[PDB]
Motif scaffolding. Sequence first.
Motif, PDB file in Angstrom:
ATOM      1  N   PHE A   1       0.856  -1.204   0.136  1.00  0.00           N
ATOM      2  CA  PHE A   1       0.038  -0.074   0.042  1.00  0.00           C
ATOM      3  C   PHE A   1       0.801   1.302   0.010  1.00  0.00           C
ATOM      4  CE2 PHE A   1      -4.210  -1.715   0.487  1.00  0.00           C
ATOM      5  CZ  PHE A   1      -3.947  -3.157   0.958  1.00  0.00           C
ATOM      6  N   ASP A   2       1.973   1.173  -0.166  1.00  0.00           N
ATOM      7  CA  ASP A   2       3.180   2.338   0.041  1.00  0.00           C
ATOM      8  C   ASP A   2       3.096   3.111  -1.345  1.00  0.00           C
ATOM      9  OD1 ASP A   2       4.225   0.070  -1.761  1.00  0.00           O
ATOM     10  OD2 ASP A   2       6.440   0.740  -1.020  1.00  0.00           O
ATOM     11  N   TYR A   3       3.230   4.639  -1.042  1.00  0.00           N
ATOM     12  CA  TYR A   3       3.121   5.461  -2.060  1.00  0.00           C
ATOM     13  C   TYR A   3       4.308   6.292  -2.307  1.00  0.00           C
ATOM     14  CZ  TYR A   3       0.399   8.679  -4.612  1.00  0.00           C
ATOM     15  OH  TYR A   3      -0.210   9.551  -5.709  1.00  0.00           O
ATOM     16  N   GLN A   4       5.324   5.782  -2.971  1.00  0.00           N
ATOM     17  CA  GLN A   4       6.577   6.206  -3.376  1.00  0.00           C
ATOM     18  C   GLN A   4       6.577   8.033  -3.968  1.00  0.00           C
ATOM     19  OE1 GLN A   4       6.322   3.233  -5.493  1.00  0.00           O
ATOM     20  NE2 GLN A   4       6.004   2.658  -3.196  1.00  0.00           N
ATOM     21  N   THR A   5       7.436   8.709  -3.715  1.00  0.00           N
ATOM     22  CA  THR A   5       7.098  10.182  -4.396  1.00  0.00           C
ATOM     23  C   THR A   5       8.522  10.872  -4.544  1.00  0.00           C
ATOM     24  OG1 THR A   5       5.887  12.019  -4.376  1.00  0.00           O
ATOM     25  CG2 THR A   5       7.096  11.632  -2.285  1.00  0.00           C
ATOM     26  N   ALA A 131       8.448   5.318  -9.578  1.00  0.00           N
ATOM     27  CA  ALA A 131       7.522   5.967  -8.165  1.00  0.00           C
ATOM     28  C   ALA A 131       6.006   6.497  -8.662  1.00  0.00           C
ATOM     29  CB  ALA A 131       8.471   7.016  -7.730  1.00  0.00           C
ATOM     30  N   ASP A 132       5.303   6.305  -7.594  1.00  0.00           N
ATOM     31  CA  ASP A 132       4.044   6.713  -8.024  1.00  0.00           C
ATOM     32  C   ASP A 132       3.507   8.025  -8.452  1.00  0.00           C
ATOM     33  OD1 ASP A 132       2.863   3.969  -7.180  1.00  0.00           O
ATOM     34  OD2 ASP A 132       3.527   4.853  -5.316  1.00  0.00           O
ATOM     35  N   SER A 133       4.510   9.076  -7.949  1.00  0.00           N
ATOM     36  CA  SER A 133       4.144  10.383  -8.233  1.00  0.00           C
ATOM     37  C   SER A 133       5.143  11.375  -7.922  1.00  0.00           C
ATOM     38  CB  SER A 133       3.041  11.036  -7.469  1.00  0.00           C
ATOM     39  OG  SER A 133       2.675  12.372  -7.850  1.00  0.00           O
TER      40      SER A 133
HETATM   41 CA   LIG Z   1       2.629   1.736  -5.437  1.00  0.00          CA
END
Ligand SMILES: [Ca+2]
Length: 315
Positions: A1-5, A131-133
Amino acid sequence: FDYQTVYFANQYGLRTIELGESEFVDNTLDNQHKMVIKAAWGGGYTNRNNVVINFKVDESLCDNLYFKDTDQPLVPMPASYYTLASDRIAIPKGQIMAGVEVQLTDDFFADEKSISENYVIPLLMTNVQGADSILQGKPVVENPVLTNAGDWSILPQNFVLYAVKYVNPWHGEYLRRGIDHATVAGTSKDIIRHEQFVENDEVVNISTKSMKDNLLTLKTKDESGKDISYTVRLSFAEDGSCTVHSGSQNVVVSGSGKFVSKGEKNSLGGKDRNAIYLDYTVNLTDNNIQLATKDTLVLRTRNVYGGKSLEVVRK
Ligand SMILES: [Ca+2]
């Protein structure tokens, strides 16, 4: 559920390219006329992918912005003054930061305005792979303006503005001692400027005018005891010698000198020191003062901060 930026940690920066010799910091990049612009990765703890951050130059980022110091506008750096090594920043698997190299061209250093806050390199991240965003911020209004903090609840960190300026090798803060053979309004005298300890000698700033020239502001007394200011311009050659010229409308000047690295032995703080030696003549034509001066200038410190945050205002 991790959200890399990915993001730029700082939005407004001031880079002073420090040419020549610095004691307290490694300026190898500076002497190659280079700088590095860095991006960071976050929102997770281990970067599992090879991350590629694409960006573009976006001159409109400078719109309506002015240096707080000078009140002059931020000016997009002309394309011919700098070369980006790539159009992307790559943060490899297992890394958390990386940078892109900027080569500043001879054109940059030839511009008279490059010694001060003027030109700015402006970058906007466009998309990211691995990365997501990109940290684009959370707007609290429609038509939000990246550079206006009030338009956001979470600030955007997808751009950076790097103001760039340079100092030449002779730029620095020096301790000055010497002897003036003076004629003040027809009256001749010797002025000895010498304190028992090198540490207490008169503090003076040699600033940068160009790749070869520097400016040094001094004062001397008139027949009434009043202090008269004037500026000398030093112009340096490949070999370390200089010629001395006027830098002030109120003075005619001639002479010679030299910069000697480690010319002063067991000088300030017991360490060997860099020094400038001058043998010159000054005619303050409006005040009727002529000086034949011999000066020794001991380097206290370069007095340059390579990287600082930049204060800007949005008039
Ligand atoms: Ca992700």
